[PDB]
């Protein structure tokens, strides 16, 4: 049994050019589970920005969307480096159980508004 990850904060406000750091919390991270960092697409679907561990075969991967595992074992920083106005949107994270019939659980969605 496992619980879905949590995404913080619910509303993040950053100035254009600064880094915008969310936090995905998930305590099952292991060889059984993987993490995803999503932003909602124009089709109202979750568009995968990044993953933990790094999805190196994702076509068009942008290293500007950075995921870092924190020492406490539960938290993961998910940062937009050098954030632009067009980076404003709705963000979330997911946890995927890899065992056959991989199951996905999403966090609640947070809002990033890039200003100035």
């Amino acid at each position, epitope marked *: 049994s496992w619980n879905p990850p949590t995404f913080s904060p619910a509303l993040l406000v950053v100035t254009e050019g600064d880094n915008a750091t969310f936090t995905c919390s998930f305590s099952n991270t292991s060889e059984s589970f993987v993490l995803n960092w999503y932003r909602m697409s124009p089709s109202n679907q979750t568009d995968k920005l990044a*993953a933990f*561990p790094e999805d*190196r*075969s994702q076509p068009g*991967q942008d290293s500007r969307f950075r995921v870092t595992q924190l020492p406490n074992g539960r938290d993961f920083h998910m940062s937009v480096v050098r954030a632009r106005r067009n980076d404003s949107g709705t963000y979330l994270c997911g946890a*995927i159980s*890899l*065992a*056959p019939k*991989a199951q996905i659980k999403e966090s609640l969605r947070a809002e990033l508004r890039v200003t100035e």
Partner: antibody
Amino acid sequence: QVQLVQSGVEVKKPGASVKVSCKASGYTFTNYYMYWVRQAPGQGLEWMGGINPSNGGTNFNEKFKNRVTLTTDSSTTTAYMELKSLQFDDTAVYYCARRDYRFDMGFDYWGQGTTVTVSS
Amino acid sequence: EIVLTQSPATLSLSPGERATLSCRASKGVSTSGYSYLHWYQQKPGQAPRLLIYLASYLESGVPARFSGSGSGTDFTLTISSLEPEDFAVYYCQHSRDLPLTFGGGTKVEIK
């Protein structure tokens, strides 16, 4: 339910170009990245490239970086591979294969293959 | 660039025998407890089929007589009891980094 049906056999001359299609059906077309891998006579399997259908992002094997163009159409759920300046070593069977966008859990479905022959 | 080496090149076996196939990577393909190594089956003239993903997970719909094991640079595919439909070429593939490469294949033949 899940299918990937590729275009038909291609017979080309050196220097020509070929465009192979891959019609996907039975699933959310943007939930899976699409990749292209070929298998030549006397050679093994060779990864050519990949495309993210949601944003059009691509990655490539450096051997094909400047000769392959990958495109997608979500309204028809079709992936396209265009290979220009064909040479003799391009004779092969060309496959499209999908991968879960969430994580790499293998190429869990392959197209049937498209034979492309380069001959004089 | 990671090179995958499959041994043996050919296994001539009868139905009911157990097949074990080796895939050795020139560099490690495991990090954080995940092994980026998949096993496919291809019969000649037909499309490949995913058998094992992440080196130990059985793809849904694939019979349980197939299993994957290993980590780092050493990996094995086991067919616990060979059936007639299992005579085919078997390939490993890594995704630790780009470019993605495949192994040379191991042909499981009937003797």
